[PDB]
């Protein structure tokens, strides 16, 4: 279980400017990664709006020490208002020393990331979707459950949950048909369809998939090796105005 801390960027910055001068303050070597790929918003075609640039590096020498392991993953655009954001995992001094170094370098100031219901559910859609080496999209499904914590007096109803077996998830999407957003057309309406509760209006605490991710508003938790690309893209649009 790895907990990810999210964080945004005010204006677009350049990070490969001085990897030689980012090390003497820290006294050990740090590598560089330059990478960009296609992020198809629509399978039929994609404009220049999905042009994304991603950076990644670490601060470590000891591979045996799995606990003292941290990664800083960057990704974002350059044409909309907010250019990019950033994410990191783990607690250490290495998670901030570079952070001050670009505190006083570029003039960008940080802010915690806010999630609400309009965004929280749609993250699991990007988590469950998969891409192969032949650019073929198939979905690996998971038995999602939701956490609800409604604020009330007398604490009459303080917490309740909804659980869906994902074979029934299979039976819902197939009934709707081939959809790229299963939670738009098979799951979320069906809860309103039967029980009459609006998931989005109600205060949602957590969306849990079966052993793949752990989504909460305060922070996202995932047991994978590294976060994917569709997740970061949907986060970027959500925090965009």
């Amino acid at each position: 279980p790895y907990t990810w801390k999210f964080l945004g960027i005010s204006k677009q910055l350049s990070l490969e400017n001085g990897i030689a001068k980012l090390n003497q303050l820290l006294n050990l070597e740090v590598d560089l990664d330059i990478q960009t790929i296609r992020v198809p918003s629509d399978p039929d075609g994609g404009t220049a709006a999905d042009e994304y640039i991603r950076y990644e590096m670490r601060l470590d020498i000891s591979n045996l020490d799995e606990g003292t392991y941290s990664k800083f993953i960057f990704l974002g655009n350059s044409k909309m208002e907010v250019p990019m954001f950033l994410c990191y995992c783990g607690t250490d001094n290495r998670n901030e020393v570079v952070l001050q170094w670009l505190k006083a370098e570029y003039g960008v100031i940080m802010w915690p990331i806010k999630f609400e219901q309009k965004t929280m559910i749609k993250l699991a859609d990007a988590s469950i979707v998969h891409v192969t080496k032949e650019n073929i999209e198939q979905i690996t499904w998971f038995s999602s459950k939701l956490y609800f914590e409604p604020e009330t007096q007398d604490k009459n109803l303080r917490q309740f949950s909804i659980e869906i077996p994902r074979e029934s998830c299979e039976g819902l999407a197939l009934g709707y048909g081939n959809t790229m957003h299963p939670y738009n057309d098979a799951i979320v309406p069906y809860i309103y369809n039967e029980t009459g509760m609006a998931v989005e209006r109600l205060p949602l605490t957590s969306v849990i998939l079966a052993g793949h991710t752990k989504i909460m508003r305060e922070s996202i938790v995932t047991s994978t090796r590294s976060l994917r690309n569709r997740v970061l893209a949907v986060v970027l649009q959500s925090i965009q105005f």
């Binding site: 005010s10 208002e81 505190k103 006083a104 370098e105 570029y106 003039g107 100031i109 802010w111 915690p112 806010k114 925090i239 105005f241």
Partner: protein, 418 residues
């Protein structure tokens, strides 16, 4: 330490951690320094678009509108202090956020930032900015109606918020006419029936008239700003309504503006139709009260001799003997009737005889009824009593001396009473 800061000031370099400046013993505490830190950056860097703190103010303002910040009001006082100066960058605080699109996202946050900046701001753009703001006053219109009210009092604040900007616009020599042109446009929007009328008296509209007229009178008493000769008044159709609507405050600044308008009238030739029409606008208002010729007058701000039949026939009026005149006189105008009553017992103190009137209206029969229910001798008619009411009303006892003084100004027959 503050003293230790003065010595290294020529050699002090500033790293860029903006909100750490803004967000609020053996050695002096840091809290005292951060008050000076804001002024330090204002003097370390000249006022320009490239200043990081100035860009921080814009960015944090957008966070409040989109509710990205934890609480909207955390940085509002900080933005107000910083944005007070920098006329070149105070406009972009307004120009960017004066669009109606930001109003839809949050109308409450826009109000507190709009009201604290517009009085400070100076006119910069020669053109492009009257219409953009006029669009904003037009934006609030069919927006409160969208909200649910014909005139929700966000418009009342924004009407005054841009009105104090006009004071900055007109006090400055440059673009003095730009404020006047906007002033006629904004007044023309407020006179319409949809926003205000006698029946539904939400007189925020008419109070923005006089607050505009007060600036017109403040600019006048002297010819520094001259209105167009074909226009001279706010509008021939615009403030003839303000005379028909008998708001005591609305009649005061208007007559003061009428004196101001008249003070420009003799300079212009008397053969002009607008000069004659505006002349007709100064007699008829003075005719409209205390002349007994209103019903005989062919023009009541553009009205023929009628109205006497029907409502008076639905329920018969129990009065007669010049019953029309008391429907017109200042002592008979329902709003101005009690102002005369307030004058009446001030006149009663002046005449040293105290007695309470039967009603708040003063006319022929009521005075006779008041007589028949203890007072000075020598006067028993309403004609002279209204005179003694008006001359005391011409004294600075109520702010509506302006109506009484204007009545005695025109005509020469009324001049001898004063």
């Amino acid at each position: 330490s503050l003293e230790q800061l003065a010595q290294n000031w020529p050699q002090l370099h500033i790293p860029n951690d903006v909100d750490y400046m803004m967000k609020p013993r053996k050695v002096m505490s840091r809290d005292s320094l951060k008050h000076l830190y804001s002024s330090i950056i204002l003097i370390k860097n000249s006022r320009d678009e490239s200043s990081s703190p100035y860009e921080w103010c814009i960015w944090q303002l957008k966070r409040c509108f989109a509710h990205q910040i934890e609480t909207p009001q955390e940085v509002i006082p900080i933005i107000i202090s910083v944005s007070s100066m920098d006329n070149k960058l105070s406009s972009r605080i307004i120009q960017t956020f004066c669009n109606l699109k930001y109003l839809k996202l949050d109308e409450l946050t826009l109000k507190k930032v709009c009201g604290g900046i517009l009085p400070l701001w100076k006119p910069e753009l020669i053109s492009g900015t009257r219409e953009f703001f006029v669009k904003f006053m037009a934006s609030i219109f069919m927006w409160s109606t969208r909200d649910g009210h014909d005139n929700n009092c966000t418009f009342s604040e924004t009407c005054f918020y841009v009105l104090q900007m006009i004071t900055n616009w007109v006090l400055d020599d440059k673009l003095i006419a730009l404020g006047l042109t906007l002033l006629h446009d904004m007044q023309s929007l407020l006179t319409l029936d949809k926003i205000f009328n006698n029946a539904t008296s939400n007189r925020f509209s008419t109070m923005a008239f006089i607050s505009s007229l007060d600036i017109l009178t403040q600019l006048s008493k002297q010819t520094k700003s001259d209105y167009a000769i074909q226009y001279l008044i706010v509008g021939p159709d615009i403030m003839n309504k303000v005379f028909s609507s008998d708001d005591p405050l609305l009649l005061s600044a208007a007559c003061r503006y009428l004196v101001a308008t008249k003070n420009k009238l003799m300079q212009y030739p008397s053969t002009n139709k607008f000069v004659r029409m505006q002349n007709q606008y100064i007699m008829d208002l003075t005719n409209y009260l205390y002349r007994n010729k209103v019903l005989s007058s062919k023009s009541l701000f553009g009205v023929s001799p009628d109205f006497f039949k029907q409502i008076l026939e639905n329920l018969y009026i129990p009065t007669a003997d010049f019953k029309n005149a008391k429907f017109f006189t200042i002592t008979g105008i329902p709003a101005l009737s009690y102002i005369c009553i307030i004058i009446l017992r001030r006149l009663e103190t002046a005449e040293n005889t105290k007695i309470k009137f039967t009603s708040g209206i003063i006319n022929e029969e009521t005075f006779n009824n008041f007589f028949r229910v203890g007072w000075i001798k020598g006067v028993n008619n309403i004609h002279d009593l209204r005179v003694k009411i008006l001359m005391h009303l011409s004294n600075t006892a109520n702010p509506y001396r302006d109506i009484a003084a204007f009545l005695f100004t025109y005509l020469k027959s009324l001049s001898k009473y004063s």
